[PDB]
Design a protein around this motif. Structure first.
Motif, mmCIF file in Angstrom:
data_model
loop_
_atom_site.group_PDB
_atom_site.id
_atom_site.type_symbol
_atom_site.label_atom_id
_atom_site.label_comp_id
_atom_site.label_asym_id
_atom_site.label_seq_id
_atom_site.Cartn_x
_atom_site.Cartn_y
_atom_site.Cartn_z
ATOM 1 N N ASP A 139 0.707 -1.082 0.369
ATOM 2 C CA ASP A 139 0.213 0.102 0.010
ATOM 3 C C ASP A 139 0.631 1.450 -0.053
ATOM 4 O OD1 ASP A 139 -2.052 1.753 0.872
ATOM 5 O OD2 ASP A 139 -1.699 1.823 2.272
ATOM 6 N N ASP A 191 -1.747 -0.836 6.182
ATOM 7 C CA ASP A 191 -1.808 0.183 7.699
ATOM 8 C C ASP A 191 -3.386 0.379 7.681
ATOM 9 O OD1 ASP A 191 -1.990 1.948 4.863
ATOM 10 O OD2 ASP A 191 -1.576 3.894 7.214
ATOM 11 N N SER A 192 -4.132 0.214 7.243
ATOM 12 C CA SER A 192 -5.301 0.260 7.010
ATOM 13 C C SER A 192 -6.986 -0.759 6.707
ATOM 14 C CB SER A 192 -6.143 1.730 6.453
ATOM 15 O OG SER A 192 -5.175 2.955 5.768
ATOM 16 N N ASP A 250 -7.409 -2.090 3.339
ATOM 17 C CA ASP A 250 -6.392 -2.748 3.074
ATOM 18 C C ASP A 250 -6.402 -4.261 3.260
ATOM 19 O OD1 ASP A 250 -4.822 -0.841 1.868
ATOM 20 O OD2 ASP A 250 -4.209 -0.316 4.010
ATOM 21 N N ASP A 264 -0.105 4.731 1.174
ATOM 22 C CA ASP A 264 -0.239 5.867 2.035
ATOM 23 C C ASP A 264 0.547 5.746 3.339
ATOM 24 O OD1 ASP A 264 -0.517 8.682 0.649
ATOM 25 O OD2 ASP A 264 -2.274 7.891 0.441
ATOM 26 N N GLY A 265 0.793 6.062 4.628
ATOM 27 C CA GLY A 265 0.278 4.738 5.036
ATOM 28 C C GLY A 265 2.473 3.910 5.722
HETATM 29 MG MG LIG Z 1 -2.334 2.818 3.954
#
Ligand SMILES: [Mg+2]
Length: 210
Positions: free
Chosen positions: A14, A171-172, A175, A16-17
């Protein structure tokens, strides 16, 4: 190239993050809008303002800071005038990420799975990461983005592998749900998510290829 003797043939990241932290890029984006609107700058010490920048989406951020009639329309006009290419260099790459890709390259296939539309290929080019990934899944390259399994299912078809031969690092929750619906073992990165594995540093990926 998949030279690993283990079961994992490909690692999917992924953005972002996981690959980058875009807080400073998002903050500079709204700071410039305040300057164009003649409004005071946002403060890092203001907890409520930072909570809005961390949780709210672009439309709701502008709708929050511009409630006076007529100001929201001018705020959206300012946001569309900003060239996001100037904000990409403000993104901060997660520590050890490039070093981890160098450790993986040739041992496993490498891919990206993001809900970003236009920016992902530009992000990879500006940070010299376009020599690593054979597939870059974006929202503009699928009918249904995460948490739908489609983007991860296209990655499995790309490498010609089974779902349990790949790892998805996210991270989400979107995901995790995408990996769950695709049957791909999920790796939680610095996140409180139920997963097959978890990581606190990107260097750990080399030990999860078994
Ligand atoms: Mg992310």
């Amino acid at each position: 190239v998949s030279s690993n003797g283990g079961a994992i043939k490909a690692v999917i990241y992924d953005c972002d993050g996981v690959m980058f932290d875009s807080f400073e890029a998002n903050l500079a984006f709204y700071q410039r809008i305040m300057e164009m609107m003649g409004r005071p700058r946002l403060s890092r010490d203001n907890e409520e303002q930072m909570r809005i920048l961390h949780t709210y989406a672009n439309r709701e951020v502008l709708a929050h800071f511009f409630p006076s009639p007529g100001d929201w329309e001018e705020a959206v006009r300012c946001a569309g005038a900003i060239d996001y290419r100037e904000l990409v260099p403000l993104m901060i790459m997660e520590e050890g990420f490039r070093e981890a890709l160098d450790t993986l390259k040739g041992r496993v296939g490498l891919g990206v799975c993001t809900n970003r539309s236009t920016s992902m290929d530009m992000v990879l080019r500006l940070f010299s990461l376009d020599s690593y990934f054979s597939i870059v899944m974006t929202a503009s390259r699928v009918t249904n983005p995460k948490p739908h399994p489609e983007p991860l299912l296209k990655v499995l078809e790309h490498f010609g592998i089974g779902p349990r031969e790949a790892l998805f690092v996210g991270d989400s929750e979107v995901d995790r749900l995408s990996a769950e619906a695709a049957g791909v073992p999920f790796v939680a990165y610095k996140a409180p998510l139920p997963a097959a594995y978890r990581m606190e540093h990107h260097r750990e990926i080399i030990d999860l290829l078994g």
